Design a binder for this molecule. Structure first.
Ligand SMILES: Nc1scc(-c2cc(C(F)(F)F)cc(C(F)(F)F)c2)c1C(=O)c1ccc(Cl)cc1
Ligand SMILES: Nc1ncnc2c1ncn2[C@@H]1O[C@H](CO)[C@@H](O)[C@H]1O
Lengths: 56, 288, 334, 210
């Protein structure tokens, strides 16, 4: 049980030293992606019948 | 001009119609909104429901139209009276088909679904409906009272086609309703259902003898209720037809004939509650 | 054994403080101003009929037309979804399948399940098994093709593995989960993948270095499903606790929860639309709910199945979502 | 054409899908050292054993190899005709007890969400090894509340009664208990008889009689 436990410590050791960005910046990046691709999303903004392959 | 008991007959008939059209369309709707009901037994039960919703919607208004009796040409009254025979015979042959299907579920239970496929169930449903159309169109195939009523039309002195008060005993010969409808296509379906359900109960009671008495008594009560509803519906009207043909100097009231007629039509009201409502898959489809 | 766990506890406390430190806001208040998507009423455009048992998995091909489906009837069916034509029906050696995948080249499919085997099928030979990838000690729960040559797998044995198909060897293994791994999702650049497990955690793995970079917790029960957000910087999970959650890699924490009080069933499958705005999720209550991924309100419902939604997927071009169900049908929606 | 390929493939689906629908599927569930192995010798990851008896094809899936939690893959076997459960009678003293762990396993599968309508075939094994081990130790080691004479017949019927009454679905599923015999014919025959009873009662429930 000790050997497994030491392996766990190294993983967190690695994870503790990483660079993190702020949620305010992180959330802005996701919203910026959604806005930039809104017109290329056929499920968000549906396309005319002829363009739609399944039911033209 | 309707009579006193005639108004009560039409009231019981429209009451039977208002019970038979929504209950049978519920059975057809529950088949369509479920995929586990695509078996062979449920094809037979939706065939009975199609025949019985046609009885509740197209045999009730034609029977009331016959019983009121408007002044009508002869072939017009045949085309009114023959859909009554077509769709009611569809009901009887569908009941026999469910009994043969239940007999095959207990007799050959392991190789049932490799014998009774929905393809073979569909040609059996088509066979029952084609046979019912043959029986109901026999009184337009030339077996009808037309010869007797035309001789009375010639004896009256009128010329051309006979126009009559459209009743059922006037256009359909009682030799058809006794020798061909009852003794061939009503009574041997009733005798076959009695023999099949006796053998179904013997095979069930043999398997359950291989807490069990209660299930066996419930099965016997279910089978006896089904046979009693068919007998109480279809035997009074046809005993009266046999009385009419065999004793002609033999009186019976008209209220007795009216009582027997709606018993025949109210078979189709009690069909979704003793055939489809007994299935657990149908009940969990009804409440959802 | 005493010192290590106390030392680990300090590490857990430090990560929590660090995660909170950069939580200067919540996604909900940042996104409050944008217009709501509104009601979405996707209609069934195709019903794919022909399976004769429960469907457990499906995967769109990268050409957005072909799709593969896996069912407990022992059949792997490839459908031309535009015409409803079946392109191939592949007979499976074991019918107890839980996952399938379509290779991006279109040259291969993969399938596996309770046989503990990932079988690779060459579609461009009839179709025959070219490889059976053996070595997992629990059921195969998921598999995804980096390319034709390489396929990452997930397993009930609590590990994930990278396989070289030509040589048949596990070339990289991914250990560290403490419960059955149920689902994995490849990043768009295929250098990272995330896995979801029955220890209620998600882990981000780097394929070529072979170890866990980050671990994401927060769910209260098993994670049945996981999918990357399309830009590869976030992902969503679906759980038996009736919630979905969005996790951000760079902020290393949960950003949003997607749940309704009148939703109490488990989630079996999740996928994003092409722009990331919609998060579609399949539920044990026989319905698919469509969430606005930025504002967490439910935008719509897809109610067209008579049993559990077990799988779903959105095309690479974004044009359609397919839903697969235990009721033996697939439906195409847009 | 493509619709010709679609229709040829759809024909093979209906053909092979009804050919695999006339085959009885029997999930085999048991505890460690409970006699699962002995049954599969008699009749012939997940291992599937296929035998044909009296023109009936039986597929028996031994899924005991899997060490993963049952709740993640037990819904794949929702459509099995019956469940064959193997219990070691001799293991009422062995090891938190082996019979108490086997009863907890039995009471979990029986009262599952997926197995409500599926009958369970119960097999009790090592009744010969039970006959000597019942004199070296009473059943008070296993069941403290037991108050019966230390003979095989009453005790076996008491252990069978303990296994049975854990069925909360007393209306919808039936437990068929058979003590495994040294005769190869007899054990397979009981399975066929139990499956036939299950198939007949399933047919009766689709009529509406049962
Ligand atoms: N063919 C059969 S076999 C049993 C009955 C039956 C009779 C009565 C009666 F009042 F006439 F005695 C009541 C009922 C019940 F359904 F209302 F209980 C059924 C019938 C009918 O013709 C019938 C009459 C009226 C209605 Cl609505 C429905 C059916
Ligand atoms: N004597 C009769 N009078 C009126 N209708 C009858 C008679 N005999 C049979 N029928 C009709 O035949 C149908 C059954 O074949 C009944 O529903 C009823 O309409």
């Amino acid at each position: 049980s000790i050997a497994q436990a030491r392996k766990l410590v190294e993983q967190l050791k690695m994870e503790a030293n990483i660079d993190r960005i702020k949620v305010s910046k992180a959330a802005a990046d996701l919203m910026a992606y959604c806005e930039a691709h809104a017109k290329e999303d056929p499920l968000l903004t549906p396309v005319p019948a002829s363009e739609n392959p399944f039911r033209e | 001009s309707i009579s006193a008991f005639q108004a009560a007959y039409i009231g019981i008939e429209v009451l039977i119609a208002l019970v038979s059209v929504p209950g049978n369309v519920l059975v057809i709707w529950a088949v369509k909104v479920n995929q586990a009901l695509r078996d062979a037994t449920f094809c037979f039960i939706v065939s009975l429901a199609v025949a019985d919703v046609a009885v509740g919607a197209l045999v009730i208004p034609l029977a009331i139209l016959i019983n009121i009796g408007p002044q009508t040409y002869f072939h017009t009254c045949l085309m009114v009276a023959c859909p009554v025979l077509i769709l009611t015979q569809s009901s009887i042959l569908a009941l026999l088909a469910i009994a043969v299907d239940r007999y095959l579920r207990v007799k050959i239970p392991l190789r049932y679904k490799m014998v009774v496929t929905p393809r073979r169930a569909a040609v059996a449903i088509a066979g029952c409906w084609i046979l019912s159309f043959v029986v109901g169109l026999t009184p337009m195939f030339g077996w009808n009272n037309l010869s007797a009523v035309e001789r009375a039309w010639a004896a009256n002195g009128s010329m051309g086609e006979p126009v009559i008060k459209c009743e059922f005993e006037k256009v359909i010969s009682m030799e058809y309703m006794v020798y061909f409808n009852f003794f061939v296509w009503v009574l041997p379906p009733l005798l076959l259902m009695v023999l099949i359900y006796l053998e179904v109960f013997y095979l069930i009671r043999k398997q359950l003898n291989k807490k069990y008495y209660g299930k066996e008594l419930k099965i016997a009560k279910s089978l006896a209720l089904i046979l009693f509803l068919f007998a109480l519906s279809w035997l009074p009207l046809h005993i009266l037809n046999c009385i009419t043909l065999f004793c002609p100097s033999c009186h019976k009231p008209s209220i007795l004939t009216y009582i027997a007629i709606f018993l025949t039509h109210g078979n189709s009201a009690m069909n979704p509650i003793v055939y489809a409502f007994r299935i657990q898959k149908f009940r969990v489809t009804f409440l959802k | 054994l005493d010192q290590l766990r106390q030392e680990a506890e300090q590490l857990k406390n430090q990560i929590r403080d660090a995660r909170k430190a950069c939580a200067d806001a919540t996604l909900s208040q940042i996104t409050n101003n944008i217009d709501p998507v509104g009601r979405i009423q996707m209609r069934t455009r195709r019903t794919l009929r022909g399976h004769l048992a429960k469907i457990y998995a499906m995967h769109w091909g990268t050409d957005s037309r072909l799709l593969v489906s896996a069912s407990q009837d022992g059949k792997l069916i490839i459908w031309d979804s535009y015409t409803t034509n079946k392109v191939h029906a592949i007979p499976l050696r074991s019918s107890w399948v839980m996952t399938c995948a379509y290779a991006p080249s279109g040259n291969y499919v993969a399938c596996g399940g309770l046989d503990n085997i990932c079988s690779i099928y060459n579609l461009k030979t009839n179709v025959r098994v070219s490889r059976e990838l053996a070595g997992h000690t629990g059921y195969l729960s998921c598999c995804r093709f980096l390319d034709d040559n390489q396929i990452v797998t997930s397993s009930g044995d609590t590990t994930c593995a990278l396989w070289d198909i030509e040589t048949g060897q596990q070339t990289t293994t991914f250990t560290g989960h403490t419960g059955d791994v149920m689902s994995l999702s490849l990043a768009p650049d295929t250098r990272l993948f995330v896995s979801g497990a029955c220890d209620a955690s998600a882990k981000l793995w780097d394929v070529r270095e072979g170890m866990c970079r980050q671990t994401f917790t927060g769910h209260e029960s098993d994670i049945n499903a996981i999918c990357f957000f399309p830009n590869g910087n976030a992902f969503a999970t679906g759980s038996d606790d009736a919630t979905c959650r969005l996790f951000d890699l760079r902020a290393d924490q949960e950003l949003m929860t997607y749940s309704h009080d009148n939703i109490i069933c488990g989630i079996t499958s999740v996928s994003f639309s092409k722009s990331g705005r919609l998060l579609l999720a399949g539920y044990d209550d026989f319905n698919c709910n469509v969430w606005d991924a930025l504002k967490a309100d439910r935008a719509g419902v897809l109610a067209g199945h008579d049993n559990r939604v077990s799988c779903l997927g959105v095309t690479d071009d974004g044009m359609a979502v397919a839903t697969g169900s235990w009721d033996s049908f697939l439906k195409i929606w847009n | 054409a493509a619709a010709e390929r679609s229709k040829m493939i759809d024909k093979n689906l209906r053909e092979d899908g009804e050919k695999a629908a006339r085959e009885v599927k029997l999930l085999l569930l048991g505890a460690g050292e409970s006699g699962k192995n002995t049954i599969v010798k008699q009749m012939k990851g997940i291992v599937e054993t296929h035998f044909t008896f009296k023109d009936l094809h039986f597929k028996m899936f031994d899924v005991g190899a899997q060490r993963s939690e049952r709740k993640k893959w037990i819904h794949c076997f929702e459509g099995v005709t019956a469940i064959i459960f193997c219990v070691a009678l001799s293991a009422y003293d062995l090891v938190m007890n082996r019979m108490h762990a086997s009863m907890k396993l039995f009471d979990s599968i029986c009262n599952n969400k997926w197995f409500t309508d599926t009958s369970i075939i119960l097999f009790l094994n090592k009744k010969d090894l039970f006959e000597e081990k019942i004199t070296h130790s009473p059943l008070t080691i296993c069941f403290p509340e037991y108050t019966g004479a230390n003979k095989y017949d009453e005790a076996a019927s008491y252990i069978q009664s303990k296994f049975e009454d854990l069925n909360k679905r007393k209306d919808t599923k039936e437990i068929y208990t058979h003590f495994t015999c040294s005769t190869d014919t007899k054990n397979v025959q009981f399975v066929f008889d139990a499956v036939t009873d299950v198939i007949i009662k399933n047919n009766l429930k689709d009529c509406g009689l049962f």
